[PDB]
């Protein structure tokens, strides 16, 4: 039970470490974590080239992320387990995660941008033009 919770600690730590590393800030365990982090870094440093976008290559549609994950991991351990494979396991998950957060960031930006830009045109562009446009805003500020 305790060992099962520590695994959760490892995964969360690896996924977090991978995310910030790619530019999204926000005996003992720490040895294991750093070791796992580094091993993952080496794995990615050696092999990342072969893959483009894992999501794209896997054809991940929303209702098939879990399946695709399980399918990949099951093939990865098809005929057994070694530490190399477990590293690739953590490494693979991290690439998925980073890839997902990236795509979703774009999605969220795309939406809110559309809400705001629609408002700007339907509600604010007339007033902007009545008052000298953006040039007069820039004069007022700076």
């Amino acid at each position: 039970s305790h060992m099962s919770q520590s695994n959760r600690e490892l995964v969360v730590d690896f996924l977090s470490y991978k995310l910030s590393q790619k530019g999204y800030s926000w005996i003992p365990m720490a040895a294991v974590k750093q070791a796992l982090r580094e091993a993952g870094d080496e794995f990615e440093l050696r092999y990342r080239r072969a893959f483009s976008d894992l999501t794209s290559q896997l054809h991940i549609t929303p209702g098939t992320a879990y399946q695709s994950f399980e399918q990949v991991v099951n093939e990865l351990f098809r005929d057994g387990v070694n530490w190399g494979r477990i590293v690739a396991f953590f490494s693979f998950g991290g690439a998925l995660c980073v890839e997902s957060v990236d795509k979703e960031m774009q999605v969220l930006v795309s939406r809110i941008a559309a809400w705001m830009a629609t408002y700007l045109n339907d509600h604010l562009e007339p007033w902007i033009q009545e008052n000298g446009g953006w040039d007069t805003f820039v004069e007022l500020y700076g």
Binding site: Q71, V72, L76
Partner: peptide
């Protein structure tokens, strides 16, 4: 078809190199 199998297989070969070197 079976992109997940294909890719998981690629990871497996890559994983096995890393393990051979430790």
């Amino acid at each position: 078809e079976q992109w997940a199998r294909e890719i998981g297989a690629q990871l497996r070969r890559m994983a096995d190199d890393l393990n051979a070197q430790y």
